[PDB]
Amino acid sequence: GSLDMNAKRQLYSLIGYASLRLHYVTVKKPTAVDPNSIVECRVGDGTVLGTGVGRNIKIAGIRAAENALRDKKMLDFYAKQRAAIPRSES
RNA sequence: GGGAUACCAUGUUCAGAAGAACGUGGUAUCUC
């Protein structure tokens, strides 16, 4: 299918190059009165592949990955980019 | 007695392209 295992595979394997600067930030810190946690699938400090939320947070973590592999246009877009990438980059 | 997050610690597992990440021991809060 297309989740967790398949996700991590997409992110790193499919779009896991050098300098990409992945950035899955965790927000909404879970609690014993509302575990619910949302993830921020972003990279480069200005790119959001998607977002995810879940009760046991994992669904949030996963949903996060599944979120990044949900934007083929963005995914592939990076493929080319990764290949292009000009000079003078930080 | 079931289940969920988390803390200290430790590792296994998913996969089976690739590699990521979750698990596990116990204390506790909540909850059923």
Swiss-Prot record:
Protein name from the UniProt record: Ribonuclease 3
Protein source organism: Saccharomyces cerevisiae (strain ATCC 204508 / S288c)
Domain DRBM intervals: 6-74
Note: Present with 4970 molecules/cell in log phase SD medium.
Function of the molecule: DsRNA-specific nuclease that cleaves eukaryotic pre-ribosomal RNA at the U3 snoRNP-dependent A0 site in the 5'-external transcribed spacer (ETS) and in the 3'-ETS. In vitro, cleaves synthetic 5'-ETS RNA A0 site in the absence of snoRNA or other factors. Has an essential growth function in addition to pre-rRNA processing.
Domain of life: Eukaryota
Residues of the full protein shown: 366 to 453 of 471
